[PDB]
């Protein structure tokens, strides 16, 4: 009766940050003790409660958000942060009670000659609300003249390719991100072994 934590963490293909993947976790037993005790992670920041405490708390629903960004953009996956990823792609609330996990992904997502399969939203009329997901491909109308779905002057496709090549530095290398959020809204059916 274990929770599908491996299906999220050890998956082959990760989603792009503009269309981040979310999985609802309920009616099972998880062990943040095992998941955090692995030297595989670059950043393991949990805001609010701590992993040791999480084994004694229970929640009606747990959410695992997974995507891929650059190394220097992991800072943006945090409460009260700004930037392209935080504003247009993935936004965390200021009162965030959850966990941000990231590890390097160069051996898995970098293709020599450039892996331009991973995209990010480059333009948006407004900043994203927390946990909002925008997957629209609508031409961004920077100017007063309409675009009518065709790219051109002041009319730009809102998504941009990541330039992932294994020769570049660490900050420009891909990173896999998993954001754990705990929801209390219902009975609590996601619990630690304790």
């Amino acid at each position, epitope marked *: 009766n274990l929770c599908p934590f491996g299906e999220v963490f050890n998956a082959t293909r990760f989603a792009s940050v503009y269309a981040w993947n979310r999985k609802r976790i309920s009616n099972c037993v998880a062990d943040y003790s095992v998941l955090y005790n692995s030297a595989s992670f670059s950043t393991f920041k949990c805001y609010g409660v701590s992993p040791t405490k999480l084994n004694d708390l229970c929640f009606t629903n747990v959410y695992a958000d997974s995507f891929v960004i650059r190394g220097d953009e992991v800072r943006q996956i945090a409460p009260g942060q700004t930037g392209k990823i935080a504003d247009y792609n993935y936004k965390l609330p200021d009162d965030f009670t959850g966990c941000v996990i990231a590890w390097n992904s160069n051996n898995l997502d970098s293709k020599v000659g450039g892996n331009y399969n991973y995209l990010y939203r480059l333009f948006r009329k407004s900043n994203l609300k927390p946990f909002e997901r925008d997957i629209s491909t609508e031409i961004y109308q920077a100017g007063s003249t309409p675009c009518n779905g065709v790219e051109g002057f002041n009319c*730009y496709f809102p998504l941009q390719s990541y330039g992932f090549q294994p020769t570049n530095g660490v900050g*420009y290398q891909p990173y896999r991100v998993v954001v754990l959020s705990f929801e209390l809204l219902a009975p609590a059916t996601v619990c630690g072994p304790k």
Partner: antibody
Amino acid sequence: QVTLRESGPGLVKPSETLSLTCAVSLSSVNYYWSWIRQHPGKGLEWIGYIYYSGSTNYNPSLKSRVTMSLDTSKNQFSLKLSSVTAADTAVYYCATPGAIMGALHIWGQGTLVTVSS
Amino acid sequence: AVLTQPSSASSTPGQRVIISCSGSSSNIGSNTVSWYQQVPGAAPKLLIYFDYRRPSGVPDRFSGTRSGTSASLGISGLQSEDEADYYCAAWDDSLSAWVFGRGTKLTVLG
């Protein structure tokens, strides 16, 4: 789309103020209006831009000597470069990247400014 | 000023050439690279914007990539009309300025 045409004196004495005007073909649009120059047989040197909001950003090399303005009346934006020397001899281009400060899509024909006594 | 470009490039008609542009985290690393063509006597012309997008009226032969701190421009099926100076450009956050490469003079030798 919009059309840019520079108009310039051509000859400016050293230590004086070089002035140019780029005529826009309305000018109350949300564009960045930039100025580019190119020394004879050399590369492109960005001078600066002026936003329709009036916001201003100049090249660090030339910031003290550069002033750019907007004029809704004549539908033109201007460039002024003070304490001009013989290093300011160049072809000056007015360009615009549009509403997003990135690549310059529309250019002017260019005007040659010679600095000599 | 801070973007590095090879002075010269060379190829033969019908072939392909690649012009590279090297910079910093402050410009190419975090900002978009655009490419311009200048035939002598004429104003510069935008070939590539947003790393790989081509504006209206530019053939498929022109292509661009950005990876880390370096950018590349590819010209397929070179013809004699393609002899020109090629400039890369990007915005520099540290300098708060728009930065150009020195330019790459391309010659079709055959």
